[PDB]
Design a protein around this ligand. Structure first.
Ligand code: NAG
Ligand code: NAG
Lengths: 439, 52
């Protein structure tokens, strides 16, 4: 037989899925996923890196006036200055004074650091879904890695699991992601070829090997003075070397629902959102008929200790009478409580304990054990400590949870005065039966 | 403060800490005085006094 179920999307929390089948011994499984990985698409928009302003040695034309040559350089910036007067070892480099001119030119390139250190503005859209899970399967700890599409299923030990497709269409990203070497940022980058001055992406490249470079930096030359033989320029402010200080916070420390961010390739880890449908196909070679199954009867259930916490909340003890020695399973028949131990050994006329947890104080429930229904009831107590560092999702119960005899209390409250207003209607209509004949 | 959802706190370079609230401690009883109501201030408060 096969079975389709839904587990809540969370890590470190097992789930007891029943398999009941007509005329056969039932079989329970437990789901416990270790990593569900959301892996977004990859489409590179543009790399970016730290630039490099290169000027050569400046030209000097004394007893003459030099002039530029127009050239398609990355931020070509040239200027000829007059009235200048250089100084060196032997005073002035030239002879006359008022005619000494200086040609100057500046351009920009990438750096040597862009080979191995860079950020990248990046285009990423709706993800896949990978997952890794563990099941205990007749005492068999079984790992599984599978994608949550619907046809990357898995056959292990005559077991067909398929996971997905994910009901939760939510993602921890946007359409625009910048990434640098250990983190991502849900950021809004400027497009290609329109980089702002003083911003990462002032210089832009399509690949790490693109010689065609876009630049927007305004290396604006200034006037050199007497003796100051050099090239004065307006400094281009970087993008990186203050953008490293204006990071804000990475998506590692502001993701919703505790989504971790890995790298190479970048992926979301343990995004606990919503729920996953899981289908199991296991054929009939693995089952057993009930004639070979040790069936039990005459159960008496009592709960001598229950504490409604997120931990192993309580231990109940139930007395059984087994037909013969063997193994069989237990499971709740209500989604409020949950039961830790899947199957259990039975031998004869004895009793067994079972650990369970819940949220509702008046624990009124039923346990299915070994193709037999048993009824139980108790009243629990609140735990005596406030915080903890592990949850267990039995507690996720609504507003139709079960209160105590407070139910009988509020049943006593709704007494009602409908009876007195009914006798009011009857006394007014016995006034009106003076003549209320044919209305 | 901790929400009913849960907290997570990172301190320095070290490993993160996770936190969750229990059904906290106390407050009245299943008592002979009626008084389950302060168990309410235990059990998910600040709503549901709209219900009373
Ligand atoms: C060093 O940088 C190169 C450049 O892309 C990268 O491929 C490589 O993985 C990096 N190695 C380490 C150890 O960071
Ligand atoms: C299966 O693995 C879990 C966690 O690794 C462990 O707690 C449990 O005892 C194991 N059970 C068996 C039967 O190996």
């Amino acid at each position: 037989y096969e079975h389709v179920t839904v587990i809540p999307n969370t890590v470190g929390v097992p789930y007891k899925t029943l398999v009941n089948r007509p005329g056969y011994s039932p079989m329970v499984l437990e789901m416990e996923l270790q990593s569900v990985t959301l892996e977004p698409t990859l489409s590179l928009d543009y790399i970016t890196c730290e630039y490099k302003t290169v000027i050569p040695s400046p030209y000097v034309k004394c007893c003459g006036t030099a002039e530029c040559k127009d050239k398609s350089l990355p931020d070509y910036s040239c200027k000829v200055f007059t009235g200048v007067y250089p100084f060196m070892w032997g005073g002035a480099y030239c002879f006359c004074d008022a005619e000494n001119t200086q040609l100057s030119e500046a351009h920009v390139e990438k750096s040597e650091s862009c080979k191995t250190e860079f950020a990248s503005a990046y285009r990423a859209h709706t993800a896949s879904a990978s997952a890794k899970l563990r099941v205990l399967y007749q005492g068999n700890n079984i790992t599984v890695a599978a994608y949550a599409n619907g046809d990357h299923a898995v056959t292990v030990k005559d077991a067909k699991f398929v996971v997905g497709p994910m009901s939760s269409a939510w993602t921890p990203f946007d359409n625009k992601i910048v990434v640098y070497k250990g983190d991502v940022y849900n950021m809004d980058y400027p497009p290609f070829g329109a980089g702002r001055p003083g911003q990462f992406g002032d210089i832009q490249s399509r690949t790490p090997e693109s010689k065609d470079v876009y630049a927007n930096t305004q290396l604006v030359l200034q006037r050199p003075a007497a003796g100051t033989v050099h090239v004065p320029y307006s400094q281009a402010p970087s993008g990186f070397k203050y953008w490293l200080k204006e990071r804000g916070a990475s998506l590692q420390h502001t993701a919703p629902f505790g989504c971790q961010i890995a790298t190479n390739p970048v992926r979301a880890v343990n995004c606990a959102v919503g729920n996953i449908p899981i289908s199991i196909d296991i054929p009939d070679a693995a089952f057993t008929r009930v004639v070979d199954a040790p069936s039990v009867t005459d159960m008496s259930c009592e709960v001598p200790a229950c504490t409604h916490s997120s931990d192993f909340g309580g231990v109940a003890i139930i007395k059984y009478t087994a037909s013969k020695k063997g193994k069989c399973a237990v499971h709740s028949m209500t989604n409020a409580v949950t039961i830790r131990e899947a199957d259990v050994e039975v031998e004869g006329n004895s009793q067994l304990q079972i650990s369970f947890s819940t949220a509702l104080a008046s624990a009124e429930f039923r346990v299915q054990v070994c193709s037999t229904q048993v009824h139980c009831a108790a009243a629990c107590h609140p735990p005596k400590d406030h915080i903890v560092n592990y949850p267990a999702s039995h507690t996720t119960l609504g507003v139709q949870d079960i209160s105590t005899t407070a139910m009988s209390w509020v049943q006593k409250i709704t007494g009602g005065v409908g009876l007195i207003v009914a006798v009011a209607a009857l006394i007014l209509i016995v006034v009106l039966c003076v003549s209320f004949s044919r209305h | 403060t901790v929400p009913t959802e849960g907290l997570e706190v990172t301190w320095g370079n070290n490993e993160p800490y996770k936190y969750w609230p229990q059904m906290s401690t106390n407050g009245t009883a299943h008592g002979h005085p009626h008084e389950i109501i302060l168990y309410y201030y235990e059990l998910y408060p600040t709503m549901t006094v709209v219900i009373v």
